[PDB]
Amino acid sequence: MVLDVTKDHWLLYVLLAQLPVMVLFRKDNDEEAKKVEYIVRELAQEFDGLIMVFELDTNKAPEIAKKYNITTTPTVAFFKNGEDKSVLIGAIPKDQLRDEILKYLG
Numbered sequence: 001m002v003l004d005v006t007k008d009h010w011l012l013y014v015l016l017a018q019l020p021v022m023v024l025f026r027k028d029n030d031e032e033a034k035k036v037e038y039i040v041r042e043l044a045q046e047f048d049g050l051i052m053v054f055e056l057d058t059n060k061a062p063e064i065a066k067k068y069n070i071t072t073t074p075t076v077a078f079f080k081n082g083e084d085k086s087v088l089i090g091a092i093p094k095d096q097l098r099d100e101i102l103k104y105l106g
């Protein structure tokens, strides 16, 4: 789902989220980028109820992209216990994204 809240409300949500959070930072204007886009939507549907998936256009919320030092898109960031724990950048294979998700489920 699209990230639609203020940077302050996003930071607050991240603090309070009781299940893992996965954020696609996108722009995207790239053929590799739209494949990561689609893969992330697929995983959101697959792990519906187990993780929260957001997508953020980095030019409509550069303060959010800025807090996480997102310099290039696509970037996938993982959140647990209120902060960003890991990032996969670029043409990330689907199985590697899946495996990151599965490590944060534990």
Ligand SMILES: [Cu+2]
Residues within 6 Å of the ligand: 009
């Ligand atoms: Cu408020």
